[PDB]
Symmetry: C3
Subunit: 283 residues, 3 copies
């Protein structure tokens, strides 16, 4: 069947791998052959209770690229009543809310209208994880047997958490965690990896791993000089926004891939909307 | 149609025939959507006063008819007349909600052939709110005649009750039940209008008195700032609807509420078959669609 | 294949006389024969870092009139990164930013995505100059050999600067600068005009030029920009009344970039010379023409 048809996407953990591969294949096919009229008569609510211009513009561009119309707001009465009302207007609800659990709460009152969570919180940012994995698969050719380093604040970086857990669903990956000692990756994730035969290590500098990595996911400030011995296929990724952790001289190098990654956000979210609102895989 | 390029500023600008046409068009668009009726139209959603509820509903109506939307959600030597003079050269219709009463009517004076639709939901003129109320009543009851309709809450300042009672009074055989604190009773001119047309009505102090007789239960809030705290403590639990209160309700009965609600309807009502306020809000889509369709498209489908 | 394709439009001075004539002919062609699906499947970003309901509504209506989709914000991370990201989503960026360099800077990071400036900076309001030029050409039949008076604050009115510079690219225009001495047209513009042997003169009242002018371009005088000792130099001579038009030529048109305050009395509005609202409306076709030329290589209509 189509396993995502009219399913809620509130958390990345609600997706089996089979689901992940399906979303990725649809993302790639829509990237190759766009379906600008697939959702021609659908209306989608873009409800950003908490403002986030980048993510809203990406989501809404995805909607328009699929031919859907958009109503919405950025920034009283209970959230449940707001959702109970809106779900009578629209065909899907894309929502970002400052409170964790708000998206699931909306699913309790949205009826048959799917909710897609665009939050950045701990629970999930499923479309961000999907666009990360999609960028990795596009640039490396696969999601198995990869070398992935994660740099920066790994205790509060929720996208490294989700991305590590999703990558652990594929075989033969090796992880390198480079962070100050005060902000190490949580043990529950390291234990998740330990229980599988997945190899991981800690490092205090990127120079230790620079020659072996296929993906460098940023959150020490990275300069172009540091990339002297990188693999030709190596890509620097970043969920964005960045401040200083990537210096601007990285931008002109071939390894800089954070903006292309953001651009792939369009095809991840197009794939999610298409799969959730379209029965038939006429993609 | 009789409404082509008509302004919709007040429900009173509509004859009984105009009103029947709007309601019939709403029913037709709910049953058989016309998603490209307004394909090449551009509509301005001008919310000088913010209202997420109404804007999302109105803009959804616009998109369900295939129209494009430009607009603003809130807010120099700029003037309302000049602003309308400019905007009416861009777009094919102007949907506007403005904090001053009379502003939409004033705008029709500078819009030329561009129709203006008043998007207010609660002041002295909220035509699309009354239209969606009437549409919900007719859809769930089969008619707008010979009905038992109860109005509950602050009936002195609940203006949607004022509009709804006046609209229902244009039909035959309706009977009204007014449940309010004595300081918040229906305006005298409306009761006099009901007597002047020979419409039967009665006053009551609680929902228990009438629950078994009513086909429509239209709820309103009672704000504490309307009353002495004395009276409010004394009377507050008296105008709150809970599931328990519906034990002897007629099977056909529907609970309506213009929304938003606070406490005046407990959440245990949502789960009963009589809760219909969200469906009412949803019918707002088709009332507003019907207005846009009749105002911007000449020939009927 | 057209010369503006995928070009950034940041300043009016980036366009030759021939370019302007092409843009204006395109605007006229789109006004006469609408192309509602010319930009179908295009997605355009409307980025108003600084609010401007006027210009935003005009620009976005243009986008929708050509069939484009619109994503954006009206506001009130670095700009380069913001553009680097957004230019991966959309096919063009329409931009208004309070800082003078922001639109050029964005062009450095937008890749192949064209940037169109919607600012009101010094030389950074190209679509305002384009709609001015288009309105002048439409009502007078030409952009050559005109008598053009500019009234009001010519020192800080940046759109009179743009317009004077653009008309100076045509032959035989004659200029009338009517302003307080403290707010006179800047010397560098007069020097540019002297260098192209273009004739201009200063005058103290609208009545002096009324009988000769084809265009009366009005702006407001904000007396705050003056010394109190100069308040008396701003009396009635920079405000147009209907009475003032007794000896005006039949073809004369009164223009104004808007908003207006008192410098054009409302009794001018019903006269045939009032043309500021039609001008604002022509903004649609100037902006449509720019978007069409920038986003479509082969423009067949």
């Amino acid at each position: 069947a189509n396993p995502l048809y009219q399913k809620h996407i509130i958390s990345i953990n609600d997706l089996s791998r089979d689901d992940l591969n399906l979303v990725l294949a649809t993302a790639a096919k829509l990237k190759a052959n766009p379906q600008p009229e697939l959702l021609k008569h659908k209306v989608i609510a873009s409800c950003f209770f908490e403002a986030s211009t980048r993510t809203r513009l990406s989501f809404e561009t995805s909607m328009h690229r699929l031919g859907a119309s958009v109503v919405g707001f950025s920034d009283g009465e209970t959230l449940a009543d707001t959702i109970s009302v809106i779900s009578t207007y629209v065909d899907a609800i894309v929502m970002r809310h400052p409170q964790e659990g708000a998206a699931r709460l909306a699913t309790e009152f949205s009826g048959n209208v799917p909710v897609l969570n665009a939050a950045d919180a701990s629970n999930q940012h499923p479309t961000q994880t999907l666009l990360d994995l999609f960028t990795i698969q596009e640039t490396q050719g696969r999601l198995d047997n990869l070398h992935v380093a994660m740099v920066g604040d790994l205790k509060y970086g929720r996208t490294v958490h989700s991305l590590t857990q999703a990558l652990a669903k594929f075989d033969g990956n090796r992880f390198y965690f480079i962070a100050p000692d005060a902000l190490a990756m949580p043990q529950y994730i390291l234990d998740m990896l330990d229980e599988k035969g997945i190899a991981w290590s800690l490092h205090s500098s990127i120079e230790e791993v620079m020659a072996e990595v296929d993906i460098l996911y940023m959150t020490f400030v990275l300069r172009a000089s540091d990339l002297h011995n990188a693999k030709a296929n190596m890509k620097v990724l970043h969920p964005l926004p960045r401040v200083d952790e990537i210096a601007t001289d990285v931008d002109k190098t071939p390894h800089a891939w954070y903006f292309q990654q953001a651009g792939n956000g369009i095809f991840a979210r197009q794939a999610l909307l298409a799969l959730v609102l379209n029965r038939d895989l006429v993609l």
